[PDB]
């Protein structure tokens, strides 16, 4: 009899809206366990590190700053 | 009987052996070497048998460099056991061999004696081999 045989239910993480798409305020952009992406302009961060839009516009990804963090912002 | 002193995991996936040995195909330590020309597996017992044959032939007048290490565990079922009920138990260790991989090098003996020793060792191996010498590039 094996001592293995367990696993957890899937969580369905990942990028939900890609660069160049238009969003409405409140749209979820990234589901992530940790801050793989950071919130830029017009983007808010939830209690579970979810990134969402706070304004209408076009999503844009970039690499910026002195640490080389990945940012996602919304351009109005 | 070479085998890792400790391992992070006990049992590993079967995998697939494909491609050529671009790394580890150049004579580095000695002057003459034996290398494989087809792919396969090399067990620890095979490695030990070939090393013993080479050392006995050359009478330990030089140095033998072994460049293969069996770090892959292989499992088998306990026999008369049905399919299922978990993976089998580790039985022996192998090294994956790709065409071009150098197995042994010899330093400090004549080419004739080295080639005789390599011909003696090649009969102990499950794949085809060839003899190479050091070159500038």
């Amino acid at each position: 009899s094996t001592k293995n045989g367990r696993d957890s239910n899937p969580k369905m993480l990942g990028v939900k809206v890609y660069g160049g798409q238009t969003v409405t305020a409140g749209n979820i952009i990234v589901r992530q366990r940790g801050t793989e992406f950071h919130a830029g302009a017009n983007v808010g961060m939830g209690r579970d590190h979810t990134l969402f839009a706070t304004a209408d516009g076009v999503v844009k990804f970039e690499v910026k700053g002195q640490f080389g963090r990945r940012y996602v912002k919304v351009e109005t | 009987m070479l085998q890792p002193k400790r391992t992070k995991f006990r049992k590993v996936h079967k995998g697939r052996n494909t491609g050529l040995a671009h790394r580890g195909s150049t004579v580095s330590f000695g002057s003459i070497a034996i290398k494989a020309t087809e792919r396969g597996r090399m067990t620890a017992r095979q490695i030990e048998a070939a090393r013993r044959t080479i050392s006995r032939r050359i009478k330990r007048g030089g140095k033998i460099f072994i460049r293969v290490f069996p770090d892959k565990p292989i499992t088998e079922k306990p026999l008369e056991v049905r399919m299922g009920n978990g993976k089998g138990n580790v039985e022996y260790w192998v090294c994956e061999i790709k065409p071009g991989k150098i197995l042994y090098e010899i330093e400090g003996v004549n080419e004739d004696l080295a080639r005789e020793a390599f011909a003696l060792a090649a009969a102990k191996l499950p794949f085809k081999t060839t003899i190479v010498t050091r070159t500038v590039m």
Binding site: - | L20, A21, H22, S25, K35, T37, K98, P99, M137
Partner: protein, 97 residues
Amino acid sequence: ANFVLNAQARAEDKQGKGASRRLRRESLVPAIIYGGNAEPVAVTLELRELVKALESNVFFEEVVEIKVGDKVENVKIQALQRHPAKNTPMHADFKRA
């Protein structure tokens, strides 16, 4: 001046993976020549001549002449690629000297 390799121009239609495999099936060897004050040039060598030259030990420390048409280049061998299992030379690098 002691070592002379007769070569042919290797054009864009003869560059690439499939073209290189066809060249090696023709028993030819691709090579590149680069070095100060000039753009790289791609050439095609003969496997026979390359093996003959590599058999000699002074070939690796002497200025050699690669001759294509009337153009002549004075170079030294910089790198070589061999087949992992067959030891056949497959590509050559030449630095202008």
